[PDB]
From a paper:
To examine the role of CCDC22 and CCDC93 in COMMD interactions and assembly of the CCC complex, we cloned all ten human COMMD proteins and CCDC22 and CCDC93 into a single biGBac construct for insect cell expression. StrepTactin-affinity isolation revealed that CCDC93-Strep and all other proteins were enriched in the desthiobiotin eluate, with size-exclusion chromatography revealing a single homogeneous peak. Western analysis confirmed a complex of all twelve proteins, with native PAGE and mass spectrometry consistent with a 1:1 stoichiometry assembly. Purified BS3-crosslinked CCC dodecameric complex was vitrified on graphene-oxide coated grids for single particle cryoEM. Data processing in CryoSPARC yielded a 3D reconstruction (overall resolution 3.1 Å). The central ring of the COMM domains was more clearly resolved than the peripheral HN domains due to their relative flexibility. The human COMMD proteins assemble into a remarkable hetero-decameric closed ring. The ten COMMD proteins assemble into a remarkable and unique structure, forming a hetero-decameric ring from five specific heterodimers, with a precise and evolutionarily conserved subunit organization. Many specific interactions between adjacent subunits determine the precise COMMD organization. Although there are many individual requirements for precise COMMD interactions, in general the β1-β2 loop within the COMM domain of each COMMD subunit docks closely into a complementary pocket formed by the HN domain and linker of its cognate dimeric partner, and these interactions involve a strictly conserved tryptophan within the C-terminal α7-helix of the neighboring subunit. One functional implication of the COMMD assembly is that the HN domains are positioned peripherally and appear to be primed for mediating specific intermolecular interactions.
Residue numbers in the entry:
A (entry chain E): 20 to 224
B (entry chain B), D (entry chain D): 1 to 199
C (entry chain I): 1 to 198
E (entry chain F): 9 to 85
F (entry chain H): 5 to 183
G (entry chain C): 1 to 195
H (entry chain G): 1 to 200
I (entry chain A): 1 to 187
The structure:
Amino acid sequence: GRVSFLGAQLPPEVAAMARLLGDLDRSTFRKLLKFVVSSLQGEDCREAVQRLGVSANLPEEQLGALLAGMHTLLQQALRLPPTSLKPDTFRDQLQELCIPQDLVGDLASVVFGSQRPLLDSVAQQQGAWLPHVADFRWRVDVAISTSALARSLQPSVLMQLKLSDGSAYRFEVPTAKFQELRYSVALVLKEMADLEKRCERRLQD
Amino acid sequence: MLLELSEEHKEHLAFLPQVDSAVVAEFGRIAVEFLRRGANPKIYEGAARKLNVSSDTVQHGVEGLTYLLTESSKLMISELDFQDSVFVLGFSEELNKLLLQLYLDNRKEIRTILSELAPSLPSYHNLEWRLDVQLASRSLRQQIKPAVTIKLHLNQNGDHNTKVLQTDPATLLHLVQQLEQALEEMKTNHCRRVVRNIK
Amino acid sequence: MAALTAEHFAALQSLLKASSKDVVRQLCQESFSSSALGLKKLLDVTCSSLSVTQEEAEELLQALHRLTRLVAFRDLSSAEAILALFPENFHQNLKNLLTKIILEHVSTWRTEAQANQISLPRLVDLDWRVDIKTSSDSISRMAVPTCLLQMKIQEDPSLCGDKPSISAVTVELSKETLDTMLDGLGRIRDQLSAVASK
Amino acid sequence: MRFRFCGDLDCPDWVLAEISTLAKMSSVKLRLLCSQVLKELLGQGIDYEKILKLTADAKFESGDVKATVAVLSFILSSAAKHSVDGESLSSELQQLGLPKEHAASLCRCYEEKQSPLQKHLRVCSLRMNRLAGVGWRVDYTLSSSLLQSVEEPMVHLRLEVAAAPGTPAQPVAMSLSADKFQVLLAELKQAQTLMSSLG
Amino acid sequence: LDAKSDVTNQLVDFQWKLGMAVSSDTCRSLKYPYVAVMLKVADHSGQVKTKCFEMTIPQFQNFYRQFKEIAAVIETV
Amino acid sequence: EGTPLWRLQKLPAELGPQLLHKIIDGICGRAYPVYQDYHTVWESEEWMHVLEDIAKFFKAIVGKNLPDEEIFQQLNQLNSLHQETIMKCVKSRKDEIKQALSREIVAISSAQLQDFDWQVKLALSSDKIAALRMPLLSLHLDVKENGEVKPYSIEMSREELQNLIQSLEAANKVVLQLK
Amino acid sequence: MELSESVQKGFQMLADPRSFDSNAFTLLLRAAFQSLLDAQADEAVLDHPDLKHIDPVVLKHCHAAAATYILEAGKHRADKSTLSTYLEDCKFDRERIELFCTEYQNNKNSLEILLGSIGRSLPHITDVSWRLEYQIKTNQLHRMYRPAYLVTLSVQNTDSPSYPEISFSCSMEQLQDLVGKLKDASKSLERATQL
Amino acid sequence: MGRLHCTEDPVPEAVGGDMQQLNQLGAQQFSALTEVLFHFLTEPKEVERFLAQLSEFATTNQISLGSLRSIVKSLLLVPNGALKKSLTAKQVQADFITLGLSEEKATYFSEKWKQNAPTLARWAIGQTLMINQLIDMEWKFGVTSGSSELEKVGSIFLQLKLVVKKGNQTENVYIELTLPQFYSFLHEMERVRTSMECFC
Amino acid sequence: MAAGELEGGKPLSGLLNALAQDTFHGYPGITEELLRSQLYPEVPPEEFRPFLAKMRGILKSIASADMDFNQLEAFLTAQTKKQGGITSDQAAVISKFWKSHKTKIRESLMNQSRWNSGLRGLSWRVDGKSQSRHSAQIHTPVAIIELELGKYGQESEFLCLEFDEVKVNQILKTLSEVEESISTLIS
Amino acid sequence: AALILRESPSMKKAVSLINAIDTGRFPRLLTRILQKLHLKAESSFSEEEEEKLQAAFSLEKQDLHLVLETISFILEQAVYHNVKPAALQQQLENIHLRQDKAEAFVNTWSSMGQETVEKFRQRILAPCKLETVGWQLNLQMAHSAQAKLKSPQAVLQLGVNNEDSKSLEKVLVEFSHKELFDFYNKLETIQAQLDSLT
């Protein structure tokens, strides 16, 4: 079924935008749209917003209202997959927001053009929260002899780890604990495979 | 799923069928206490010497019984799965009933113990706040600058920790709106589908 | 172990765009050698040398990293060992050039992998001075030997942070302590001699 | 619509529910529980065996005594925070549906403790550390390698900085020249003279 | 020449101050005379560093006497 | 043999006053001279050596506060143009060097306050009470220790500020006896 | 407004047509304002011939006096009445008083922006991010089947521009409690306006 | 008093009075006091033991603790100076006779000094300055079989742990050497040894 | 009220000593309940406490003030003549206490006034150099030095140093400049 | 045979004391010592156990310390040479241990020597070592910038000890299945190297 892309009600920011843009110069709107899309891509723009504002004779509060409402609207539209937010539902819901059709078409050019898969590839980057492995390395040795023991021949594995936050660690582990680690990893991999194959089917039912 | 015993765990339990059922029940009570208080080998010594048995055998027996109670509380197998487990262990219906009673009366408490072995993630404890207005400063002696002062309380590993923070009102309204949207996303249909079907 | 792919081979075929074989040598040694910090520079070197895009440079450097690390890891140091990796459609005029290049560098790559492998803090220099204590705050006259020993020790910046922070340690040994330590050290000699005699 | 004791909001669903658990106690036992909760808000604590023996004959579970202590401490904090009076408390409680004698039993407790409790809540408001004390030494310098005669005073200051009453303070210890000391004194006197106009 | 001295620390400079405490919040007449010394030091770790300490006149005089003993010994040895 | 100014003798006297003044400003903690203005006169090693030697000389001369006859005798090595240049550079501003030296004497201690700021707030309300209406001060201190500056912050009620003011006044009633 | 003798003596000389013509005085004010607000300011600010004909000691002393008075007037939010009163006490004429007060008014807001930039403040929250997950199984417990939230606040160190994150986890009850106390903290502003 | 070897400074007359008190105390009392003093000299850090044994002496002899500590210090003066100057027993006995200890009792204390001075001297030398003194060392040989870069490896190495004294603190230093660096380390340590044997 | 009856010389001297030990020497084992149960076991806490506190306040007022015996006699005259004052016997014992304990307290106040790190001690040896990897002989001795330092109530810092004969001479000259300053100022 | 055990006056004193003590209780205490021998951080007995040991032996404190130290040194040499019981018996006979104590010694050695040898064999010298492993498995459902997610995530914890800090650490990591498969392939290559070492 259809879903309201804004959620259960319009936030006051997007209402304030919609009441402001009703006669804005499309060139300035296109510039603001480029800025918003660039800032969603990770860039920064305070000097370009400023020189546009002074060029457009736009007050700081009007630029702020415009930018905030367009960012909220496009962020909410990206949150849904584009198959669910089918373009008829998008255009109709923006028409209920009373956006002028030229600006509806301009927003659709953001939500459905080649910028879409790039933004999707950026949105996935929020999902970590806990750092992933950066790299892993090892050395495996035989002691042969030791201060306590004329001979030993026990193996040991030295291991070293770095994490995507810049943390790094080095530790050595005996063979029994290495076998426990290897078993635990294989177990969790099996459980993850089974869980994925269950969910992927049961959510079709 | 069935809690199929290892051959070592079979050999461990195979001691108890020789013990008097009242003493198997006593070993059950001791084991299900040891699940929470921790073990005490003087009990193994005393019970074995009363049985005229070697203390290692009683130790192996009691700890096998503790492992049975742990794994059954981890899995939360059904009554009939536990019955099938003790039947394939080959215990008599006296001991099957005893073990089932020991299980069903305590598996919840064991789980309230075993949950502590999950890895420690930092988590929220409390929030404190203060609305205050800056009115002067050494360089500029009349002004009006409102802010919401905040103190955040957290814990990790059972510790206590705090953070001191500040926000403006517009940001605070944005925080409220976003965290309200976090709660709305548990009422939407997809998450309710997961929560029901992936049970 | 990590291995080549069809897209790595397609990227490798970009390497014939080199203006001179010295570019091939450089990009091989760098992509074997480079850290993730070095790749940022090596990408621009590859683009400047081959006119490739940054993405094509990234795919080429990834392919060369995978290839050279695989070769070092298995010790594929012979023509009969290396030449079978490349697919039957690969550029044979690249096949021979890259083979002979690899077979020349692999000895260096093999040699330096024994340094790049991980270690505890490594000794890099040592110094010592022996002196006689003659007087003190407590005994007006004395005469006994002492050794001052010094070591300079490196740590891995991977753990040490921005710098390997080469740092110094000194130790003082009395004669009984030195004789005990050598009644250690010599045991290593004797046991190694026994193992060689075994 | 709205409840004044909830700060012009609607009452939380858990409060409107758990006040019915309060309604299941007797009025005198509710009075005693309210008094013990007021002691808890005044920081005297509470004890599980007390609230049990006050309630276990009414078949209260541990969860029920815990929840009734929670709801009482909530409602009496909210009452004191908005400084709303016992007659208004009794009215909003009757609108929630607490029995007449139970509401009067709460009001007879709250009407005594409200002023002490509001004072305590004013003291217990959030603070960005506190100045526990000050120490100083004044010295005079005669000569140095850098100036064979100096003839100048110097001051040492220590601030004992703490988080909360009874927390161990840490000494911020520093040395000042007599000029910076006198400038600091004058600036602090200005800030005090300003602040005394605002209070 | 080689850094045979590097096995031990070296004093870069010696600076001194003579003064008197006069009072504290605990005592109106804390007439304690003292010498304060600042030592600036460089070391095998790199970066020049400094230490400060304060000692009473009898302790200073004992320190000075001990350096006189060190001088007398290194002259005698 | 000669005093550390022996290195100065080569400088053209028409360039001396600017160099010596800007180095004295460096002693006062102001900007030191830029090397570019003098790289034709000294190599960078000799440049840092003059930056040490001149400061050491001026500090030594003013620290013993010697009379100008003893200064002049202590300048028998200098050329007459440099003698007069250095003599005017001392007598014209020795007091800035003396204030810098007494500031360095205060640095013979374990920690020092570099600078401070103060701010006054009104707290309107809290999660504890809706009418807190409490005046507050924050004092911010920047204290040098171990070769770095630490930020500190001390909030105060009116009562805490009064106790601090009274104890500072008690200290000032002593400082006024000595200064 | 309490001021040092050096300041009032400087203004008592700035008062006098013989020390400075009223145009020279106005140019010296312009020089003072530039010497405060421009980071590239330098002694070249005194190079104008209406300035260079004054004794350099008097010129530099009165420049510093003017700049100090401008700073104090900004700090205490001086106005045309108090300015005119002080200038009358300094025996300025009406035209030089008006020329001062008009040039102060012309520069006042840049000086307001300058002065309010001073001093530290607490780390300021900039954004929030959240993730929602279902906990299913763990090292010992295979039946967890419960929701949890993973939350992050982005913040700036306002004292030293740098951007740490604070991250924590919430069960749904903890998230509802956090939301409820942030809502109360927001309604605080409405209740304070209507208090 | 006459000139003393144990002290260059004059000595209070209370020390002379205490020495006459050593003549007043009985032979068993003087012997027990001497044992208490040598116990304090050899193990002064066992302050609780010293206090216990001197309180026992006090209650045994009805001697007040102030007088006991006085006569202790007055008699420890000579052993203390003898340890400072490394005096002979003859000089110690002459100083005792000069302070006022009767010749027989000074001879007894001289013999108790003779039988203790070497271990006391060794203990006192143990109190002098040592910098980063080695407490202990551990070592482990080994052959490396593999790494993330090489499936098979021939490198051979030595690891050492050195334990180091840093005032009241201690430290562990971990280091790894190649085989040629082990050979050069042992060669340099033999060059140290022969240089140490030149003078030990 | 018992405050007028706690006059017993032995227990009162014990109490006064223990209060001085607690307040100034920092003895941790001394407490109100211990003092009461040893020295005045029948006096109830509500009547021992006010006198205990007031006499501690008197002792602090004396100890903090460097009272000479005339100022002390005046203060004790006030504390006896005022209503609820101490007795003449309490003043007499306070006088004899100050007359027998002044210097130890004042010394403890001086010792307590720590601010700068203290010199806890100095240790040194002089070694004659010999064989080294640098040269088969080395022709000079050196002093090896270490100061021990630290703030009050903290673990000791240690600072070790090496000086040659030239450094030793320079340090001796520097210290002689300090001694000559001190002697000039005290002369 | 080569010398196994040092002969000296301190050992002669200690064995003279050992011969004076009974043979009955001695092997139990030596077994507890032997059980503790591989532990550096604690004494083999509590202060009250050491007190009751001294009361049973009646020895003065330093004589008991000489006894316990020399039996510790005896067991360290027995470990180091992995001594055969009969060889230890002959060695103790050359020390002039009483024959019944030599029997009690070699019976004690037979009771625990291989176990203590193995406890020495597994000791790790590195300044840090791994202790424990645990894991958590979740399904991701939505986040602040995407919804209708189905991604499983596994958090991994590695429990570790630092012997320089003498404290725990708990490293935390995430894997998106892809990294967990890669990490497993690396761990299986480590296993292949540990097998090929055999």
